[PDB]
Amino acid sequence: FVEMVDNLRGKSGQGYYVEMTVGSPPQTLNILVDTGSSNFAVGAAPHPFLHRYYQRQLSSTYRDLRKGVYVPYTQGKWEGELGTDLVSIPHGPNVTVRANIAAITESDKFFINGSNWEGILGLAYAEIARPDDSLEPFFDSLVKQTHVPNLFSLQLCGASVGGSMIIGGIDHSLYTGSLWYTPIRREWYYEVIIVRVEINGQDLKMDCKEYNYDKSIVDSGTTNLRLPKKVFEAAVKSIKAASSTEKFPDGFWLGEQLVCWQATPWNIFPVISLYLMGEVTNQSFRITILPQQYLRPVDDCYKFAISQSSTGTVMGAVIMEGFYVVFDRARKRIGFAVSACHVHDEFRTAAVEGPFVTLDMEDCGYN
């Protein structure tokens, strides 16, 4: 699958994008890869911050759907006109599909000044598609119309940034050791269940139900490891105590202040471990991240890449950059393995380990 290796680019905190073509003749766009939503959308108008945009008038294969669409993310909204057209991924599989495209005719806080992408590829499931689950997501169309296997994988490497999206398969050169799989709880977002959290090999002793309140998701469109309201406070209290040697302001832990060092004590910062529900009754595994994953370079004034949430645990780029991540849509599961590209020193290294015995793992799902 070497055709597809290193096909991702980006800037820190700004997301990862892949080159795509739309329409006939092919129009090239850079497209944010987003496992945390399900719409395919591209700029269709000359917004001052856009390098380029979808020109429907130039495409013989374009077809109107005569429907409006509105999509708001956490911050950032866009509005668009639904249609279909022919889509390719140049450094992806050698195929062309007819897919739904939201032509963005108006946005708000969506397109970033100075960014190099012109659209967004929602890779999650129809249930969370706008306007409703009858708008077939790009990946569903790709599988329906070709022989490409219902599976994709992401190696996000991490002010330039790189990675790989392997469509339709797995590339064993991108990970070391073994893949461990967690069930997709339900096909809307990529929902999984966290069953135990260890800061520095030490349990937070919280009810596991409150690691997944009100859900836990794997989301490549989110930069941060985002932890729910209760668990964040518990987590940070543990991270504070682990790092008592130095002090930092209250705003720093809330992502309200940068903390600066001269080109930095990695030790005195604890590894963070999430235990995930395994494939088997009472069997779990754990994934372990270094502080180089949760301390975001932005002197070296890093940012604290962990934040509280009203919407659940979000396993963002902070988590994903430690690992090769397999979205095995065929078997309703997500695989994790140690990435061949993750940022590590010589003292500590990112890990995926198992099996472990954890009882009552189902009780960790919120209802």
Ligand SMILES: CO[C@H](C)C(=O)N[C@@H](Cc1ccc2c(c1)OCO2)[C@H](O)CN[C@H]1CC2(CCC2)Oc2ncc(CC(C)(C)C)cc21
């Ligand atoms: C956490 O905020 C980040 C920046 C963000 O919103 N990322 C976007 C993808 C995105 C969106 C806008 C962007 C962008 C990337 O780069 C800059 O502009 C990602 O899709 C968010 N994924 C979940 C993440 C969550 C948090 C828990 C679910 O909130 C969301 N809310 C709304 C949506 C859209 C739909 C309701 C239509 C599905 C999705 C999500």
